[PDB]
């Protein structure tokens, strides 16, 4: 299988953080295009605050999807409006529903779609832009498009990003690529909500060890100088 | 414990106080020569096994690829 | 040496006090560096 090529991502930087406008744009993409079939279960409206949206913007986004509580005296499936503490919506009620609404194929939860894939984010982009006409000599069953990157090159998922599929609220031209890069950044974001933070800890950590090591070594060399200067002499009485 | 470890005789041993001596006497002055001295006494025993590991690793990779590469003569 | 390096007690005080300030200072500088990098 074709290994996805290395792309010059900003967050790939060692001391570089994630571009948060790209995470906001990639969250929009999911909200509009890929949410209806995939499930971001482990990501909730609460996680976004302080990353892509404010408290009121994320509250409005959460109030945009109703949820089910069902604790009514008799009402057992009561469907509430949804809140910040609520998690992202699910595409299908159960695994079977997924198989049913996706030609038998199960769309995997994207909660950690990238940390899952070996190629990493690159792979996601490779495929998102990897739908390709099947090389002469091959055919597929349903919604299966030869995708070189996808294992077997037969992904049930039909190509979901057509240029100008959705309009970015920021207005950045919604070209297929600009959309695949944004959703790869976002999917990366969910898989590690602390990419940035971890990197801040790594910076300070480096600096701290950077001052402690030299010093500790010095001490190691104070308390070991005594011996390292010891001069031995053999003086048989003769 | 100390005192009953061993029996030596007539071996005088001089030393200096830590604060009285330079911390890194000629550190790079002789350190480099010594490190280099050291590397040349051990490089012939250490390095050639890892060199042939590198050759076997590359070989395996390339051989594997060729193995995977379709047989042109086949299917024709 | 005559203030913080003569007797263990004196040494201890400077350590506590200095560490008290170094903490914030380190974070502050890190802020610049972190923001600088990003």
């Amino acid at each position: 299988e074709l290994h996805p090529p290395s792309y010059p991502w900003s967050h790939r930087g060692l001391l570089s953080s994630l571009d948060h406008t790209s995470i906001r744009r990639g969250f929009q993409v999911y909200k509009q295009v890929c949410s209806s079939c995939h499930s971001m279960d482990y990501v909730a409206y609460r996680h976004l605050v302080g990353v892509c949206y404010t408290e009121e913007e994320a509250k409005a986004l959460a109030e945009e999807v109703e949820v089910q509580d069902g604790p009514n005296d008799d009402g057992e499936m009561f469907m509430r409006p949804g809140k910040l503490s609520d998690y992202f919506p699910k595409p299908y009620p159960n695994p079977e529903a997924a198989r049913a609404a996706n030609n038998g194929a199960l769309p995997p939860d994207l909660s950690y779609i990238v940390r899952a894939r070996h190629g990493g984010e690159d792979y996601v982009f490779s495929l998102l832009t990897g739908y390709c006409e099947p090389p002469t000599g091959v055919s597929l069953r349903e919604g299966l498009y030869f995708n070189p990157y996808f294992p077997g090159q037969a992904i049930g998922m039909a190509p979901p990003i057509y240029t100008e599929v959705l309009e970015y609220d920021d207005g950045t031209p919604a070209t297929m690529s600009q959309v695949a890069k944004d959703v790869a950044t976002f999917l990366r974001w969910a898989s590690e909500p602390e990419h940035d933070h971890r990197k801040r800890m790594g910076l300070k950590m480096l600096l701290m060890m950077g001052l402690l090591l030299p010093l500790t070594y010095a001490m190691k060399r104070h308390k070991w100088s005594v011996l390292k200067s010891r001069k031995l002499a053999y003086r048989p009485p003769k | 414990e100390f005192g009953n470890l061993a029996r030596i005789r007539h071996v005088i041993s001089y030393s200096l106080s830590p604060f009285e001596q330079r911390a890194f006497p000629s550190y790079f002055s002789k350190g480099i020569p010594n490190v280099l001295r050291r590397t040349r006494e051990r490089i012939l025993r250490v390095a050639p096994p890892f060199v042939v590991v590198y050759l076997i690793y590359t070989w395996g990779n390339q051989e594997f690829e060729q193995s995977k590469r379709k047989n042109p003569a086949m299917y024709e | 040496y005559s203030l913080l390096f003569r007797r263990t007690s004196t040494f201890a005080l400077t350590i506590a006090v200095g560490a008290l300030f170094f903490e914030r200072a380190f974070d502050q500088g890190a802020d610049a560096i972190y923001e600088h990098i990003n």
Binding site: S225, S229, K231, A233, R235 | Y14, L16, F19, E20, Q21, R22, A23, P25, S26 | Y1, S2
Partner: peptide
């Protein structure tokens, strides 16, 4: 006896003010 040989020279090591050191 005990005087014939003197302290070997540690000059090299010696850091040729003590409070400062």
């Amino acid at each position: 006896s005990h005087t014939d040989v003197k302290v070997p020279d540690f000059s090299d090591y010696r850091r040729a003010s003590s409070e400062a050191r």
